[PDB]
Write a protein that binds this ligand. Structure first.
Ligand SMILES: CC(C)CN(C[C@@H](O)[C@H](Cc1ccccc1)NC(=O)O[C@H]1CO[C@H]2OCC[C@H]21)S(=O)(=O)c1ccc(N)cc1
Lengths: 99, 99
């Protein structure tokens, strides 16, 4: 697909057996998903952007499907205002920026 | 060009006549640049990011060149951690996401 940027580039994802809406985000390497009760080991992390930092849980090797494309990698879970798919998983689904 | 996402999609911009580095950011509605002297009238505004809200100076109708492509639009100036080119200008240079 080609996604123009008039509107937020939102897609459906599947993670932890749940469907969610998420924003395709070239602005960070990591993926951040809103609080959800994912099973297994995690490590505390703090990530910072406009407005400051939030505390998240870093989960590794999380299976996540993005607009019908399978991926697996690190997923940060925490009180982000918007689910954001970062460059790490964008590369796995073959996403590029074009102009 | 076509830009893959293994690395941060950083480009050189020119704004207020000065060269700077900035991040092409599909996860940003708006363009936010670190504090700088910029010619033009501005209006006080607030914007929210992952960590909360900040005050910015809103400059409308600003000439800005992005990786050699011309845009004229709204540039927010304030305490962002990274210069970011958001969708308001990415659309002007005809950027799309593709996978
Ligand atoms: C500021 C960037 C360098 C980094 N961010 C990604 C960025 O794309 C966020 C992604 C984002 C998107 C929506 C809400 C919160 C965060 N967008 C953002 O802050 O944009 C702001 C400018 O335009 C406005 O439109 C959206 C918010 C405003 S970030 O969300 O803060 C972030 C920071 C660190 C990590 N590890 C992961 C993500």
């Amino acid at each position: 697909p080609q996604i123009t940027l008039w509107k937020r580039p939102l897609v459906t994802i599947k993670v932890g057996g749940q469907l969610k809406e998420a924003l395709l985000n070239t602005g960070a390497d990591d993926t951040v998903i809103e609080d959800m009760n994912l099973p297994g080991k995690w490590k505390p992390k703090m990530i910072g952007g406009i407005g400051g930092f939030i505390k998240v849980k870093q989960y590794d090797q999380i299976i996540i499907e993005i607009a019908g494309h399978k991926a697996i990698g690190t997923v940060l879970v925490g009180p982000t205002p918007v689910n954001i798919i970062g460059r790490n998983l964008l590369t796995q689904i073959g996403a590029t920026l074009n102009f």
